[PDB]
């Protein structure tokens, strides 16, 4: 119920599920959710963002997370508008057993509205440091 | 446009 | 309006102001506003956020921002809960002609309610990479 507890709990679930069953990450998202990792839509075209569960799942599959390892170095999680929780993660992530790379990831979690203390991911924005500097 | 500024306190 | 343009214009304004008048940075915030600009404890763990315009001000002045020069290398911005805008930012900061340092930042801009196009910073999360990684 506390925003930091909500945030830490979600970050633990998220990066672990990205390891064990990336095909289940879609459960975090809803019709209004934006997912922003910035390459191409599953069907081939560029996209600022991917919207809703159906296309977010497709995009997650197309990233082809396999033996994905994460190490989290810090989490910031604060109460934001409309009982949402804004969450900034800083960590290292490797995919396909390649070298680790530093990343930031911003989340906005929102009350899901039908089960108490249940949140969905309204926003998910990911960014490797290396592609920027 | 776009105002981001608020009154003091 | 357009979340992209709102966030792009706020970032320009924030870093202009951080340079020209850091004693007025606190005007972007309200009673519920969360702020951190890096730093760490006596235990070496990252510093806690403070809340509200008054404490945000006491904290901005302890940073002693002078000639604060910033290079912004990434800005993204997206519609979030209640026609709010979440902004992710990476770039480089030098205060007082000291080290050029990398940072990862998230903002949440929330509509103030009174007029079209009037927002306040509900959350400001800044961390330097050298303190966290």
XYZ file of N, CA and C in Angstrom:
825
model
N 0.822 -1.205 0.000
C 0.000 0.000 0.000
C 0.843 1.235 0.000
N 2.056 1.145 0.496
C 2.942 2.273 0.444
C 3.561 2.268 -0.931
N 3.743 3.433 -1.496
C 4.275 3.481 -2.862
C 5.629 2.783 -3.058
N 6.566 2.984 -2.130
C 7.850 2.274 -2.200
C 7.685 0.742 -2.113
N 6.776 0.255 -1.264
C 6.518 -1.195 -1.167
C 5.878 -1.684 -2.484
N 4.923 -0.925 -3.018
C 4.320 -1.254 -4.313
C 5.423 -1.354 -5.398
N 6.234 -0.294 -5.510
C 7.348 -0.229 -6.455
C 8.375 -1.346 -6.354
N 8.897 -1.582 -5.151
C 9.888 -2.648 -4.944
C 9.299 -4.016 -5.299
N 8.056 -4.259 -4.898
C 7.357 -5.522 -5.173
C 7.225 -5.769 -6.678
N 6.824 -4.740 -7.413
C 6.659 -4.837 -8.858
C 7.991 -5.052 -9.583
N 9.021 -4.309 -9.195
C 10.355 -4.420 -9.821
C 10.914 -5.844 -9.650
N 10.763 -6.410 -8.462
C 11.126 -7.801 -8.205
C 10.394 -8.766 -9.154
N 9.065 -8.626 -9.296
C 8.235 -9.484 -10.183
C 8.591 -9.294 -11.646
N 8.651 -8.044 -12.058
C 8.943 -7.696 -13.424
C 10.257 -8.276 -13.948
N 11.379 -7.964 -13.309
C 12.669 -8.425 -13.873
C 12.887 -9.940 -13.768
N 12.260 -10.574 -12.781
C 12.267 -12.034 -12.625
C 11.445 -12.774 -13.695
N 10.339 -12.162 -14.097
C 9.407 -12.774 -15.051
C 9.964 -12.602 -16.457
N 10.721 -11.528 -16.627
C 11.477 -11.259 -17.818
C 12.589 -12.296 -18.010
N 13.051 -12.856 -16.890
C 13.933 -14.014 -16.885
C 13.216 -15.340 -17.110
N 12.120 -15.598 -16.393
C 11.601 -16.988 -16.364
C 10.540 -17.247 -17.398
N 9.759 -16.234 -17.731
C 8.620 -16.418 -18.602
C 8.243 -15.077 -19.218
N 9.080 -14.589 -20.148
C 8.766 -13.307 -20.741
C 7.354 -13.277 -21.320
N 6.875 -14.419 -21.818
C 5.473 -14.556 -22.304
C 4.348 -14.278 -21.293
N 4.684 -13.956 -20.043
C 3.699 -13.609 -19.026
C 3.755 -12.132 -18.627
N 4.674 -11.364 -19.224
C 4.808 -9.944 -18.877
C 3.540 -9.197 -19.272
N 2.884 -9.674 -20.333
C 1.658 -9.047 -20.814
C 0.587 -8.870 -19.727
N 0.561 -9.739 -18.722
C -0.397 -9.592 -17.610
C -0.329 -8.285 -16.837
N 0.835 -7.649 -16.859
C 1.020 -6.318 -16.247
C 0.275 -5.160 -16.916
N -0.148 -5.331 -18.170
C -0.589 -4.219 -19.005
C -2.112 -4.292 -19.256
N -2.679 -3.157 -19.667
C -4.110 -2.993 -19.927
C -4.310 -2.166 -21.189
N -5.573 -1.990 -21.586
C -5.943 -1.361 -22.870
C -5.257 0.003 -23.115
N -5.096 0.786 -22.038
C -4.487 2.124 -22.069
C -2.931 2.171 -21.946
N -2.293 1.044 -21.650
C -0.871 1.013 -21.361
C 0.024 1.279 -22.580
N 1.073 2.059 -22.358
C 2.080 2.324 -23.358
C 3.386 1.646 -22.967
N 4.035 1.036 -23.945
C 5.284 0.334 -23.712
C 6.312 0.862 -24.726
N 7.393 1.441 -24.226
C 8.263 2.240 -25.051
C 9.712 1.793 -24.928
N 10.105 0.871 -25.820
C 11.459 0.253 -25.908
C 12.174 0.508 -27.269
N 11.428 0.996 -28.262
C 11.959 1.782 -29.378
C 12.773 1.108 -30.472
N 12.142 0.222 -31.247
C 12.840 -0.452 -32.345
C 12.008 -0.539 -33.597
N 11.082 -1.482 -33.598
C 10.086 -1.650 -34.648
C 8.894 -2.453 -34.071
N 7.682 -2.147 -34.530
C 6.493 -2.961 -34.239
C 6.775 -4.411 -34.647
N 6.144 -5.369 -33.968
C 6.270 -6.794 -34.311
C 6.051 -7.042 -35.815
N 5.126 -6.284 -36.423
C 4.833 -6.372 -37.863
C 5.733 -5.510 -38.818
N 6.877 -5.007 -38.323
C 7.964 -4.472 -39.172
C 8.259 -2.963 -39.187
N 7.273 -2.135 -38.815
C 7.368 -0.666 -38.904
C 7.924 0.004 -37.608
N 8.595 1.190 -37.727
C 8.996 1.931 -36.505
C 7.803 2.375 -35.651
N 8.034 2.535 -34.352
C 6.994 2.968 -33.429
C 7.584 3.630 -32.173
N 7.226 4.901 -31.983
C 7.346 5.598 -30.701
C 6.908 4.721 -29.515
N 5.780 4.039 -29.680
C 5.176 3.257 -28.622
C 4.308 2.143 -29.176
N 4.006 1.211 -28.284
C 3.188 0.058 -28.538
C 2.110 0.123 -27.449
N 0.860 -0.102 -27.838
C -0.315 0.234 -27.022
C -1.171 -1.019 -26.816
N -1.686 -1.212 -25.586
C -2.588 -2.323 -25.230
C -1.894 -3.672 -25.014
N -2.565 -4.605 -24.339
C -1.983 -5.928 -24.092
C -1.577 -6.722 -25.325
N -2.424 -6.728 -26.360
C -2.220 -7.615 -27.519
C -0.927 -7.266 -28.235
N -0.690 -5.975 -28.462
C 0.509 -5.537 -29.196
C 1.738 -5.478 -28.314
N 1.558 -5.177 -27.030
C 2.672 -5.222 -26.063
C 3.229 -6.620 -25.903
N 2.352 -7.629 -25.880
C 2.779 -9.033 -25.860
C 3.591 -9.376 -27.118
N 3.083 -8.959 -28.266
C 3.742 -9.222 -29.528
C 5.156 -8.620 -29.493
N 5.236 -7.359 -29.086
C 6.497 -6.660 -28.999
C 7.457 -7.347 -28.019
N 6.936 -7.816 -26.896
C 7.774 -8.471 -25.904
C 8.338 -9.762 -26.476
N 7.504 -10.519 -27.187
C 7.953 -11.740 -27.868
C 9.007 -11.467 -28.934
N 8.817 -10.400 -29.683
C 9.722 -10.087 -30.758
C 11.093 -9.637 -30.252
N 11.179 -9.155 -29.012
C 12.469 -8.792 -28.412
C 13.255 -10.047 -28.075
N 12.530 -11.156 -27.898
C 13.121 -12.469 -27.839
C 14.045 -12.513 -26.650
N 13.501 -12.178 -25.471
C 14.229 -12.213 -24.196
C 14.535 -13.677 -23.909
N 15.815 -14.034 -23.847
C 16.198 -15.421 -23.603
C 17.466 -15.458 -22.747
N 17.371 -16.109 -21.591
C 18.418 -16.092 -20.563
C 18.814 -14.658 -20.150
N 17.783 -13.830 -20.104
C 17.873 -12.466 -19.720
C 18.156 -12.370 -18.236
N 19.260 -11.698 -17.894
C 19.663 -11.447 -16.525
C 19.693 -9.970 -16.258
N 19.273 -9.637 -15.046
C 19.176 -8.288 -14.597
C 19.858 -8.209 -13.233
N 20.486 -7.069 -12.958
C 20.959 -6.717 -11.631
C 20.551 -5.266 -11.397
N 19.736 -5.045 -10.366
C 19.164 -3.730 -10.033
C 20.067 -3.048 -9.043
N 20.447 -1.794 -9.296
C 21.335 -1.075 -8.367
C 20.584 -0.041 -7.535
N 19.436 0.422 -8.029
C 18.647 1.358 -7.269
C 17.227 1.488 -7.779
N 16.298 1.738 -6.859
C 14.917 1.969 -7.236
C 14.388 3.180 -6.514
N 13.773 4.062 -7.304
C 13.015 5.181 -6.806
C 11.528 4.923 -7.145
N 10.671 5.074 -6.146
C 9.231 4.820 -6.251
C 8.449 5.827 -5.389
N 7.629 6.659 -6.035
C 6.931 7.773 -5.383
C 5.463 7.801 -5.773
N 4.638 8.293 -4.854
C 3.238 8.507 -5.143
C 3.133 9.621 -6.159
N 2.300 9.392 -7.164
C 2.050 10.361 -8.239
C 0.542 10.468 -8.464
N 0.117 11.372 -9.344
C -1.302 11.668 -9.579
C -2.234 10.453 -9.755
N -3.437 10.549 -9.164
C -4.487 9.547 -9.277
C -4.163 8.165 -8.666
N -3.552 8.222 -7.463
C -2.976 7.071 -6.735
C -2.021 6.208 -7.556
N -1.393 6.799 -8.566
C -0.421 6.070 -9.341
C 0.883 6.050 -8.555
N 1.828 5.265 -9.067
C 3.153 5.177 -8.487
C 4.108 5.289 -9.629
N 4.978 6.278 -9.555
C 6.026 6.432 -10.570
C 7.274 5.753 -10.020
N 7.939 5.011 -10.888
C 9.057 4.140 -10.496
C 10.203 4.319 -11.505
N 11.362 4.781 -11.027
C 12.592 4.764 -11.824
C 13.570 3.687 -11.269
N 13.940 2.792 -12.180
C 14.899 1.754 -11.957
C 16.202 2.152 -12.650
N 17.338 1.854 -12.036
C 18.630 1.905 -12.712
C 19.276 0.559 -12.464
N 19.725 -0.093 -13.537
C 20.336 -1.416 -13.413
C 21.169 -1.841 -14.621
N 21.538 -3.118 -14.622
C 22.291 -3.726 -15.683
C 21.389 -4.828 -16.180
N 21.336 -5.012 -17.497
C 20.564 -6.080 -18.113
C 21.346 -6.713 -19.247
N 21.391 -8.046 -19.272
C 22.000 -8.744 -20.386
C 20.944 -9.634 -20.996
N 20.899 -9.716 -22.328
C 20.094 -10.707 -23.067
C 20.974 -11.667 -23.883
N 20.493 -12.901 -24.049
C 21.242 -13.936 -24.767
C 22.661 -14.125 -24.236
N 22.817 -14.065 -22.926
C 24.134 -14.183 -22.328
C 25.191 -13.236 -22.903
N 24.764 -12.100 -23.450
C 25.731 -11.101 -23.927
C 26.185 -10.222 -22.762
N 27.064 -9.258 -23.018
C 27.573 -8.412 -21.931
C 26.418 -7.640 -21.297
N 26.528 -7.359 -19.996
C 25.583 -6.483 -19.291
C 25.686 -5.076 -19.842
N 24.583 -4.334 -19.767
C 24.534 -2.936 -20.211
C 23.668 -2.134 -19.253
N 24.134 -0.942 -18.893
C 23.406 -0.058 -17.976
C 22.133 0.466 -18.594
N 21.076 0.573 -17.794
C 19.795 1.023 -18.317
C 19.052 1.851 -17.283
N 18.166 2.699 -17.778
C 17.152 3.269 -16.956
C 15.807 2.753 -17.454
N 14.835 2.686 -16.558
C 13.475 2.308 -16.942
C 12.502 2.997 -16.029
N 11.567 3.722 -16.635
C 10.587 4.515 -15.919
C 9.267 3.757 -16.032
N 8.564 3.625 -14.903
C 7.228 3.005 -14.910
C 6.259 3.977 -14.320
N 5.015 3.908 -14.777
C 3.917 4.470 -14.050
C 2.915 3.354 -13.843
N 2.691 3.023 -12.574
C 1.758 1.974 -12.182
C 0.497 2.664 -11.748
N -0.648 2.088 -12.112
C -1.930 2.700 -11.831
C -2.825 1.681 -11.184
N -3.672 2.105 -10.220
C -4.653 1.162 -9.630
C -5.459 0.507 -10.728
N -5.525 -0.811 -10.694
C -6.204 -1.551 -11.751
C -7.757 -1.422 -11.632
N -8.278 -1.141 -10.434
C -9.676 -0.689 -10.272
C -10.761 -1.693 -9.886
N -10.429 -2.987 -9.958
C -11.360 -4.102 -9.638
C -10.904 -5.083 -8.570
N -9.596 -5.144 -8.306
C -9.037 -5.877 -7.180
C -8.238 -4.867 -6.387
N -8.467 -4.862 -5.071
C -7.751 -3.980 -4.131
C -6.223 -4.195 -4.143
N -5.502 -3.074 -4.045
C -4.038 -2.981 -4.075
C -3.388 -3.597 -5.325
N -4.152 -3.706 -6.398
C -3.642 -4.307 -7.606
C -3.354 -3.178 -8.583
N -2.169 -3.266 -9.168
C -1.694 -2.290 -10.084
C -1.420 -2.865 -11.448
N -1.637 -2.060 -12.465
C -1.167 -2.399 -13.790
C -0.168 -1.332 -14.246
N 0.564 -1.621 -15.308
C 1.578 -0.740 -15.777
C 0.957 0.150 -16.813
N 0.713 1.406 -16.473
C 0.203 2.355 -17.464
C 1.341 2.737 -18.428
N 2.547 2.923 -17.896
C 3.714 3.287 -18.705
C 4.943 2.480 -18.400
N 5.634 2.106 -19.476
C 6.866 1.417 -19.362
C 7.799 1.931 -20.437
N 8.851 2.633 -20.027
C 9.805 3.290 -20.935
C 11.207 2.818 -20.593
N 11.896 2.185 -21.539
C 13.217 1.588 -21.325
C 14.273 2.251 -22.173
N 15.488 2.343 -21.645
C 16.556 3.018 -22.335
C 17.917 2.520 -21.870
N 18.683 1.988 -22.813
C 20.096 1.686 -22.575
C 20.875 2.967 -22.596
N 21.758 3.116 -21.623
C 22.698 4.250 -21.563
C 23.611 4.298 -22.782
N 24.064 3.142 -23.249
C 25.048 3.111 -24.341
C 24.544 3.719 -25.638
N 23.288 3.443 -25.996
C 22.619 4.036 -27.190
C 22.378 5.568 -27.134
N 22.739 6.199 -26.011
C 22.514 7.609 -25.741
C 23.803 8.442 -25.645
N 24.804 7.940 -24.967
C 26.084 8.597 -24.863
C 27.103 7.863 -25.718
N 2.588 28.298 -26.260
C 2.123 28.353 -24.880
C 2.914 27.376 -23.972
N 2.329 27.067 -22.803
C 2.757 26.076 -21.785
C 3.310 26.832 -20.579
N 2.490 26.945 -19.538
C 2.925 27.439 -18.251
C 3.262 26.243 -17.322
N 4.441 26.302 -16.701
C 4.902 25.307 -15.722
C 5.106 25.888 -14.308
N 4.826 27.178 -14.138
C 5.237 27.942 -12.959
C 4.059 28.202 -12.050
N 4.320 28.177 -10.756
C 3.300 28.182 -9.730
C 3.603 29.346 -8.850
N 2.635 29.738 -8.042
C 2.844 30.769 -7.053
C 3.807 30.266 -5.952
N 4.462 31.229 -5.305
C 5.462 30.969 -4.284
C 4.746 30.382 -3.071
N 5.307 29.288 -2.535
C 4.617 28.247 -1.734
C 3.224 27.809 -2.262
N -2.379 18.936 -24.283
C -1.863 18.980 -25.636
C -1.047 17.782 -26.023
N -0.041 18.035 -26.829
C 0.819 16.941 -27.284
C 1.829 16.627 -26.176
N 1.777 15.400 -25.606
C 2.722 15.067 -24.534
C 4.179 15.235 -24.949
N 4.486 14.896 -26.190
C 5.856 15.014 -26.621
C 6.283 16.467 -26.522
N 5.470 17.368 -27.065
C 5.885 18.746 -27.108
C 5.904 19.332 -25.710
N 4.936 18.962 -24.859
C 4.892 19.479 -23.468
C 6.205 19.148 -22.743
N 6.588 17.868 -22.781
C 7.790 17.393 -22.108
C 9.085 17.965 -22.662
N 9.136 18.124 -23.983
C 10.303 18.740 -24.624
C 10.462 20.191 -24.180
N 9.355 20.952 -24.158
C 9.360 22.361 -23.710
C 9.626 22.538 -22.219
N 9.147 21.607 -21.387
C 9.438 21.671 -19.942
C 10.914 21.431 -19.624
N 11.526 20.491 -20.332
C 12.935 20.132 -20.101
C 13.843 21.316 -20.449
N 13.596 21.912 -21.610
C 14.278 23.141 -22.000
C 14.134 24.194 -20.910
N 12.912 24.380 -20.419
C 12.675 25.387 -19.381
C 13.370 25.081 -18.076
N 13.329 23.807 -17.674
C 13.924 23.361 -16.407
C 15.437 23.608 -16.389
N 16.107 23.189 -17.457
C 17.557 23.320 -17.528
C 18.039 24.747 -17.848
N 17.294 25.494 -18.647
C 17.486 26.948 -18.711
C 17.443 27.566 -17.298
N 16.349 27.313 -16.570
C 16.175 27.870 -15.238
C 17.220 27.380 -14.255
N 17.482 26.071 -14.238
C 18.550 25.564 -13.361
C 19.854 26.367 -13.563
N 20.169 26.727 -14.805
C 21.320 27.598 -15.108
C 21.136 29.071 -14.680
N 20.047 29.704 -15.137
C 19.898 31.161 -15.001
C 19.421 31.572 -13.600
N 18.500 30.806 -13.016
C 17.969 31.131 -11.691
C 17.559 29.899 -10.866
N 18.540 29.192 -10.281
C 18.212 28.003 -9.464
C 17.447 28.318 -8.165
N 17.561 29.546 -7.676
C 16.754 29.982 -6.520
C 15.253 30.041 -6.786
N 14.845 29.943 -8.054
C 13.449 29.921 -8.421
C 13.012 28.564 -8.985
N 13.900 27.576 -8.979
C 13.517 26.249 -9.462
C 12.277 25.725 -8.726
N 12.176 26.032 -7.424
C 11.095 25.549 -6.557
C 9.683 25.935 -7.001
N 9.576 26.965 -7.824
C 8.290 27.396 -8.355
C 7.594 26.391 -9.256
N 8.288 25.350 -9.747
C 7.674 24.335 -10.636
C 6.797 23.335 -9.887
N 6.874 23.347 -8.553
C 6.355 22.261 -7.728
C 5.161 22.704 -6.881
N 4.486 21.736 -6.264
C 3.407 22.000 -5.296
C 3.556 21.160 -4.025
N 2.572 21.283 -3.124
C 2.579 20.660 -1.787
C 2.896 19.162 -1.782
N 2.383 18.441 -2.778
C 2.634 16.983 -2.891
C 3.857 16.556 -3.712
N 4.771 17.472 -4.010
C 5.757 17.229 -5.064
C 6.968 16.531 -4.480
N 7.497 15.530 -5.179
C 8.666 14.753 -4.727
C 9.905 15.186 -5.491
N 11.012 15.424 -4.780
C 12.258 15.878 -5.417
C 13.518 15.226 -4.846
N 14.384 14.724 -5.737
C 15.781 14.379 -5.385
C 16.739 14.751 -6.499
N 17.888 15.273 -6.102
C 18.964 15.543 -7.009
C 20.200 14.822 -6.488
N 20.144 13.501 -6.616
C 21.253 12.612 -6.320
C 21.742 12.705 -4.900
N 23.059 12.641 -4.738
C 23.669 12.596 -3.415
C 23.491 11.265 -2.714
N 24.105 11.159 -1.537
C 24.025 9.937 -0.733
C 24.245 10.200 0.752
N 23.935 9.197 1.572
C 24.013 9.272 3.048
C 25.442 9.216 3.590
N 25.532 9.242 4.925
C 26.696 8.743 5.686
C 26.909 7.212 5.569
N 25.832 6.442 5.362
C 25.945 5.008 4.993
C 26.293 4.718 3.494
N 26.518 5.758 2.684
C 26.858 5.599 1.265
C 25.698 5.192 0.355
N 24.463 5.253 0.867
C 23.281 4.874 0.102
C 22.628 6.143 -0.486
N 21.980 6.024 -1.643
C 21.473 7.245 -2.280
C 20.511 8.055 -1.391
N 20.528 9.380 -1.537
C 19.755 10.285 -0.688
C 18.279 10.208 -0.955
N 17.504 10.458 0.090
C 16.057 10.390 0.036
C 15.461 11.638 -0.641
N 14.278 11.467 -1.237
C 13.509 12.573 -1.778
C 12.956 13.436 -0.651
N 12.688 14.707 -0.949
C 11.970 15.602 -0.063
C 10.724 16.075 -0.816
N 9.770 16.609 -0.059
C 8.444 16.925 -0.602
C 8.022 18.360 -0.323
N 7.380 18.954 -1.310
C 6.816 20.286 -1.158
C 7.797 21.360 -1.559
N 7.244 22.469 -1.971
C 7.978 23.572 -2.493
C 9.019 24.136 -1.516
N 8.663 24.186 -0.232
C 9.538 24.743 0.802
C 10.768 23.906 1.054
N 10.600 22.599 1.240
C 11.742 21.689 1.441
C 12.548 21.506 0.129
N 11.842 21.437 -0.995
C 12.469 21.394 -2.299
C 13.400 22.597 -2.472
N 12.979 23.767 -2.002
C 13.832 24.947 -2.080
C 15.084 24.819 -1.208
N 14.925 24.408 0.057
C 16.080 24.243 0.980
C 17.101 23.270 0.393
N 16.601 22.226 -0.274
C 17.452 21.258 -0.926
C 18.139 21.778 -2.200
N 17.451 22.571 -3.013
C 18.059 23.113 -4.252
C 19.240 24.035 -3.959
N 19.121 24.781 -2.864
C 20.137 25.725 -2.445
C 21.347 25.044 -1.800
N 21.163 23.894 -1.140
C 22.318 23.108 -0.609
C 23.189 22.516 -1.729
N 22.602 22.300 -2.907
C 23.377 21.917 -4.082
C 24.255 23.060 -4.597
N 23.979 24.317 -4.222
C 24.801 25.464 -4.630
C 25.011 25.405 -6.127
N 23.912 25.398 -6.881
C 23.981 25.415 -8.343
C 24.487 26.767 -8.833
N 25.634 26.745 -9.514
C 26.220 27.920 -10.114
C 26.827 27.523 -11.457
N 26.526 28.299 -12.498
C 26.922 28.001 -13.894
C 26.547 26.592 -14.348
N 25.436 26.105 -13.803
C 25.026 24.748 -13.997
C 24.809 24.570 -15.469
N 25.750 23.880 -16.088
C 25.719 23.574 -17.502
C 25.301 22.103 -17.709
N 24.324 21.918 -18.581
C 23.672 20.648 -18.825
C 23.715 20.349 -20.334
N 23.999 19.102 -20.706
C 23.816 18.620 -22.084
C 22.776 17.479 -22.063
N 21.653 17.684 -22.742
C 20.578 16.714 -22.761
C 20.749 15.879 -24.000
N 20.860 14.565 -23.797
C 21.118 13.589 -24.854
C 19.920 12.652 -25.142
N 18.920 12.653 -24.269
C 17.685 11.909 -24.515
C 16.519 12.544 -23.717
N 15.386 12.669 -24.399
C 14.141 13.164 -23.811
C 13.050 12.348 -24.448
N 12.254 11.646 -23.654
C 10.993 11.143 -24.168
C 9.895 11.527 -23.220
N 8.664 11.526 -23.740
C 7.501 12.056 -23.043
C 6.239 11.374 -23.527
N 5.351 10.998 -22.603
C 4.179 10.200 -22.951
C 2.979 10.530 -22.083
N 1.807 10.419 -22.686
C 0.563 10.550 -21.970
C 0.503 9.419 -20.938
N 0.112 9.829 -19.727
C -0.013 8.949 -18.582
C -1.390 9.216 -17.912
N -1.536 8.879 -16.634
C -2.818 8.984 -15.937
C -3.247 10.417 -15.907
N -4.560 10.618 -16.073
C -5.212 11.919 -15.998
C -4.633 13.020 -16.838
N -4.329 12.682 -18.090
C -3.785 13.639 -19.049
C -2.517 14.337 -18.464
N -1.772 13.559 -17.664
C -0.466 13.925 -17.160
C 0.546 13.448 -18.175
N 1.790 13.849 -17.974
C 2.876 13.528 -18.908
C 4.107 13.038 -18.129
N 4.555 11.823 -18.424
C 5.793 11.282 -17.820
C 6.974 11.551 -18.766
N 8.077 12.034 -18.221
C 9.226 12.430 -19.028
C 10.452 11.689 -18.543
N 11.130 10.989 -19.439
C 12.407 10.379 -19.152
C 13.500 11.209 -19.805
N 14.603 11.405 -19.093
C 15.672 12.291 -19.520
C 17.002 11.644 -19.163
N 17.929 11.611 -20.121
C 19.326 11.341 -19.820
C 20.156 12.424 -20.425
N 21.263 12.697 -19.775
C 22.130 13.745 -20.230
C 23.329 13.828 -19.337
N 24.018 14.959 -19.432
C 25.248 15.229 -18.693
C 25.071 16.553 -17.957
N 25.601 16.646 -16.739
C 25.526 17.879 -15.927
C 26.882 18.215 -15.327
N 27.261 19.484 -15.435
C 28.389 20.063 -14.706
C 27.853 21.232 -13.908
N 27.979 21.163 -12.587
C 27.781 22.316 -11.742
C 29.085 22.983 -11.343
N 29.109 24.316 -11.352
C 30.254 25.096 -10.884
C 31.557 24.743 -11.630
N 31.418 24.401 -12.918
C 32.540 23.954 -13.763
C 33.285 22.763 -13.193
N 32.561 21.894 -12.493
C 33.131 20.665 -11.943
C 32.954 19.574 -13.005
N 33.194 18.319 -12.622
C 32.981 17.146 -13.483
C 31.692 17.171 -14.321
N 31.832 16.878 -15.624
C 30.716 16.460 -16.507
C 30.232 15.032 -16.178
N 29.039 14.905 -15.603
C 28.530 13.617 -15.044
C 27.239 13.178 -15.692
N 27.052 11.880 -15.832
C 25.851 11.348 -16.454
C 24.735 11.162 -15.423
N 23.505 11.429 -15.849
C 22.350 11.296 -15.002
C 21.230 10.666 -15.739
N 20.343 10.070 -14.963
C 19.112 9.484 -15.434
C 18.031 10.180 -14.597
N 17.023 10.691 -15.286
C 15.956 11.451 -14.679
C 14.562 11.085 -15.223
N 13.578 11.149 -14.327
C 12.180 10.974 -14.667
C 11.432 12.149 -14.111
N 10.505 12.702 -14.888
C 9.551 13.706 -14.374
C 8.126 13.228 -14.535
N 7.248 13.643 -13.627
C 5.798 13.557 -13.910
C 5.217 14.956 -13.851
N 4.723 15.436 -14.987
C 3.991 16.715 -15.065
C 2.469 16.448 -14.984
N 1.804 17.140 -14.064
C 0.351 16.956 -13.834
C -0.337 18.273 -14.128
N -1.530 18.227 -14.782
C -2.267 19.481 -15.056
C -2.709 20.157 -13.756
N -2.532 21.467 -13.678
C -2.814 22.170 -12.440
C -4.339 22.286 -12.221
N -5.109 22.107 -13.310
C -6.570 22.155 -13.290
C -7.170 23.472 -13.798
N -6.504 24.608 -13.534
C -7.110 25.935 -13.764
C -7.305 26.313 -15.226
N -6.264 26.125 -16.035
C -6.297 26.504 -17.443
C -5.831 25.346 -18.291
N -6.237 25.351 -19.557
C -5.593 24.511 -20.543
C -4.102 24.842 -20.503
N -3.282 23.818 -20.700
C -1.827 23.966 -20.820
C -1.043 24.447 -19.568
N -1.654 24.400 -18.366
C -0.940 24.704 -17.113
C -0.660 23.447 -16.251
N 0.628 23.167 -16.036
C 1.095 21.986 -15.302
C 2.003 22.370 -14.135
N 2.208 21.409 -13.250
C 3.229 21.467 -12.193
C 3.979 20.108 -12.158
N 5.145 20.098 -11.524
C 5.970 18.921 -11.462
C 5.516 18.186 -10.239
N 4.827 17.050 -10.450
C 4.374 16.238 -9.325
C 5.531 15.430 -8.773
N 6.390 14.929 -9.677
C 7.618 14.207 -9.325
C 8.832 14.578 -10.172
N 9.965 14.744 -9.496
C 11.256 14.967 -10.110
C 12.289 13.986 -9.516
N 12.655 12.977 -10.291
C 13.637 11.985 -9.843
C 14.920 12.054 -10.674
N 15.982 12.580 -10.087
C 17.268 12.719 -10.776
C 18.256 11.845 -10.032
N 19.046 11.054 -10.735
C 20.187 10.361 -10.077
C 21.403 10.464 -10.974
N 22.573 10.707 -10.411
C 23.828 10.611 -11.186
C 24.198 9.162 -11.242
N 24.637 8.686 -12.406
C 25.076 7.280 -12.589
C 26.271 6.880 -11.758
N 27.204 7.795 -11.551
C 28.408 7.516 -10.722
C 28.140 7.224 -9.228
N 27.025 7.731 -8.702
C 26.617 7.462 -7.337
C 25.887 6.107 -7.230
N 25.266 5.639 -8.309
C 24.406 4.458 -8.235
C 25.134 3.247 -8.798
N 25.694 3.366 -9.971
C 26.446 2.299 -10.551
C 27.866 2.323 -10.031
